[PDB]
């Protein structure tokens, strides 16, 4: 691994950093709320006569299973533009609540039901918010929304004072003041009737062919989930690194009971950096701390590959009563796990050291591990030994109030010193 | 500028020890200094006293330090061993003989007195 | 760490990051270089003595009082009262948030291994003078060393021998006052606190910046991956990858500049320790204010403290000259 | 200044910039540090008497 890291076939004496280790989770637990009954979306979808734009209906659905691949049979269409969610993934997500609605318009403005779309057909009739997330469906409804004599049940508004607020419906019918003449009379010049009606005939082609629009609009919030799909619940495990799913909140780690005084309305726990800390069980009323699985870094202390072939491993910043567990049956993030707990395991403030024997001795530091611990390759035939660094040779000076020491001979010596002065010039 | 073109009094700047000389050499993208320095060696320890009292007047060394091998008293330089007889041009007088701690008795030889007493008679 | 920070242990995130190339290898190399440099910094300031010297059991120095600075064996750690005050004055949930890859390695030279160096330097500088800077240490009585030090600044040596008691009293009183001077004001140790605050604040702002959106759907990798299909999920997470890479690059650049700043102060401290401590300095206003006499080193969290002992004239009388 | 440079006193530009996070806080901090440093520089060269 070190040879791969350095992109070379030869390495020199020193300590190198290679990669990280992480105890992968063993099993998974999935807990959902206990949803009862099925809400039929088919009868919700269709109406005997689709309401006009100036007065559109809406239904709010909750407390039922969320199956969404069944609607392909109860409504003909061509697009199924589910922008927010992948259609096949709806069987698992848990939602707060959902809205369903439908209304009939002309085909010239099918793309006008979208965030940021302006114009009289959307500004004064129906405009989406800029952060819409749903499954808009548009169908060319000529077989069921037209008559040879001209179907006249369809209505919209064209004149009004100012733009309407998002998802607001106005059903009043009052003569708009579109001139200097005071519009108090029933009708006349400069007094226009706000409600213009469509005229639909089979002679009309595309564009003017009437269309029907069906909208399912989700809304997601960190609130008690009431809608979720058909997924089976599972049981609970504790104190072991596992995958967990809670109400649609995927995660991985260890779960342990904690003395968190959550108030009844408070549900989640959070801390700095938007990291989830505690979760509330969808079935029982219990609060538990969540802690990420143990991880760390691995370093390789080796002498020169010229000299020998043995190495020693150092796991940084982990108590190595859990490293043998980290050496599991094809579970540890590093592929190699041969070392495991093959004796000569030493504990150090920096981390845990495998492959070297502690010696009650003191030399000069050669390969520095840290916290005053340094290793070397030597005999005791040849092995790796780790020891506490030695500052130097202890000395005692016979200080006294009437003593002096004077030299009687000298020595000339010559030393060397090297200093860089410049670097290679370049141009790009 | 400092080590080569002169002598440096800064401690442990131009080499380890008392500095004597330097020589420069060139290397690829750099320079190499050869520092020639001075280091003491064999040590001998003796007894010392901060002052010498002759006639009630203290005698302090001019430049050096007092020392004694056990019987006589000599004055020597700090960084080398070179004893000399305590004459009147190695010491200077300052004060009386009661305000100093550690003063010891001795006689300071006066080169003028016997020379000018033998001749004058 | 490269991956564990940018990618929340995902699988497709790692493969998408491999496309960008070897950006994070330089980040992993620069931090290692900085760590090696900061381990080497403390090896020059302190490790300048050949051997660990020791003081004699009997402690009497011409009437001078060094009890405030010499190590006291009563404490478990051989640290002088001044060092004990300094350690308490500097103040070293926040660490639990560093589970995203951030780590702090321990220094190579532990604290008592530094206290032993400081004690050795003090013993050498109060027993043998400056002679142990160059060659083997040579014993010399302390008042004689003081006489040499006065002779070094143009004052004849009889001045000390006639005024030993007054100088001893002044030195003792000065040390006594300087012991309380640090504790009186709280802003004496400001640079060290600035160092620790800058490091902590940089780490905190990195961790907080981790949770931004950078114009994406959400700030959590798991939600976006389980929320959309891959062909749009990758488009959504590309912006997150770019933002986090930019944040890491900014962090490492700032750390490089700060390390370059610190190295100069380390070199200056090494020069002061070589010149002021192991000898007498003729440079003006370098080793304290006034004519320089001596210096004493002490250790503090991530720093060194010098006590400069200097000489200053006082009462003046004016005469006529020719 | 953060906003006045990137955003020409607009309103939507400010809201779009808030989503990026706290990039310009460090820019406002570093320049202040430099200004304090350059004010302190002249206090050592001259103010020695
Ligand atoms: C490494 O883990 C072991 C096992 O938990 C620790 O040993 C126990 O540590 C706790 C507190 O950490 C003590 O209360 C127990 O008395 C310890 N038991 C034994 C048998 O030692 C050990 O302390 C951990 N390592 C470190 C450095 O804390
Ligand atoms: C000072 O030391 C030097 C060597 O360090 C001594 O010179 C040696 O003298 C002996 C006796 O003549 C020779 O056998 C050696 O070959 C000399 N060494 C060298 C390097 O020349 C010198 O004698 C010493 N000084 C005194 C006064 O003894
Ligand atoms: C201390 O130094 C004195 C210096 O005079 C030594 O005295 C001399 O010793 C030599 C050795 O035989 C004699 O030849 C001289 O005549 C002595 N000088 C005088 C004035 O009598 C003395 O021996 C030395 N003592 C020790 C222990 O080294
Ligand atoms: C030699 O030194 C001794 C003590 O260091 C001196 O002894 C005292 O000298 C004073 C003043 O002359 C006398 O009042 C004391 O009575 C002396 N005490 C003793 C025990 O002798 C001495 O004067 C010095 N000089 C000589 C020539 O002995
Ligand atoms: C020279 O020798 C020692 C050096 O420290 C000192 O003797 C001690 O002096 C103090 C106070 O004068 C006494 O409390 C100790 O009991 C002495 N130590 C002994 C007698 O072992 C002093 O500096 C000098 N001693 C003399 C006798 O002049
Ligand atoms: C050197 O200074 C220390 C510090 O003041 C002296 O120790 C003090 O002694 C007094 C009187 O016995 C006590 O009230 C203090 O509590 C002591 N302080 C400490 C820190 O122990 C010491 O006596 C001085 N040395 C001499 C020779 O006077
Ligand atoms: C669902 O089943 C659990 C399992 O015992 C039960 O406790 C709960 O009352 C049921 N109903 C709801 C709404 O959770
Ligand atoms: C239209 O809605 C009505 C309402 O009950 C329903 O009976 C009818 O089957 C629907 N027709 C469809 C979905 O084609
Ligand atoms: C390996 O070491 C031997 C002895 O130290 C030396 O002769 C040889 O050149 C080295 N090999 C390489 C590839 O450096
Ligand atoms: C080393 O020291 C430990 C504890 O101090 C002791 O248990 C062990 O026997 C010693 N071994 C040797 C070879 O000195
Ligand atoms: C010189 O020092 C030694 C111990 O290092 C001591 O035994 C000896 O007595 C000293 N010399 C003299 C003349 O006292
Ligand atoms: C000393 O200076 C003062 C003014 O500071 C002056 O009055 C006095 O005459 C001076 N001394 C002599 C001896 O001139």
Residue numbers in the entry:
A (entry chain C): 298 to 677, 689 to 736
B (entry chain C): 1030 to 1150
C (entry chain B): 737 to 828, 849 to 1078
D (entry chain A): 737 to 785
Give the published text.
Owing to multiple mutations to the spike protein, including in the receptor-binding domain (RBD) and N-terminal domain, Omicron BA.1 infection can result in substantial NAb evasion. The Omicron variants that have emerged more recently contain similar RBD sequences to BA.2, with the addition of L452 and F486 substitutions—L452Q in BA.2.12.1, L452M in BA.2.13 and L452R/F486V in BA.4 and BA.5—and exhibit a transmission advantage over BA. We expressed and purified the prefusion-stabilized trimeric ectodomains of BA.1, BA.2, BA.3, BA.2.12.1, BA.2.13 and BA.4/BA.5 spike (S-trimer). We determined the cryo-electron microscopy (cryo-EM) structures of these S-trimers at overall resolutions of 3.1–3.5 Å.
All the S-trimers contain Gly-Ser-Ala-Ser (GSAS) and 6P mutations along with the T4 fibritin trimerization domain for increased stability. Of note, one RBD in BA.2.13 was clearly disordered, representing a stochastic movement, which, together with BA.2 and BA.2.12.1, suggests structural heterogeneity in the S-trimers of BA.2 sublineages. Of note, S-trimers from the BA.2 sublineage harbour relatively less compact architectures in the region formed by the three copies of S2. By contrast, BA.1, BA.3 and BA.4/BA.5 spike possess relatively tight inter-subunit organization with more buried areas between S2 subunits. In line with structural observations, thermal stability assays also verified that S-trimers from BA.2 sublineages were the least stable among these variants, which might confer an enhanced fusion efficiency. Additionally, the BA.2 subvariants displayed slightly higher binding affinities for hACE2 than the other Omicron variants. The results reveal that the lack of G496S in BA.2 sublineages meant that the hydrogen bond with hACE2 K353 was regained, increasing their binding capability, in line with experimental observations revealed by deep mutational scanning (DMS) assay. However, we found that BA.2 subvariants BA.2.13 and BA.2.12.1 showed increased immune-evasion capability over BA.2—with BA.2.12.1 exhibiting greater evasion than BA.2.13—and BA.4/BA.5 exhibiting even greater evasion. Since group E2, D1 and B antibodies are sensitive to mutation at residues 452 and 486, it is highly probable that BA.2.12.1, BA.2.13 and BA.4/BA.5 can specifically target those antibodies, rationalizing the large decrease in NT50 of plasma from individuals who have recovered from BA.1 infection against those variants. However, group D1 antibodies showed reduced efficacy against L452 substitutions, with L452M (BA.2.13) causing mild escape, L452Q causing moderate escape (BA.2.12.1) and L452R (BA.4/BA.5) causing severe escape. Of note, BA.2.12.1 and BA.4/BA.5 display increased evasion of neutralizing antibodies compared with BA.2 against plasma from triple-vaccinated individuals or from individuals who developed a BA.1 infection after vaccination.
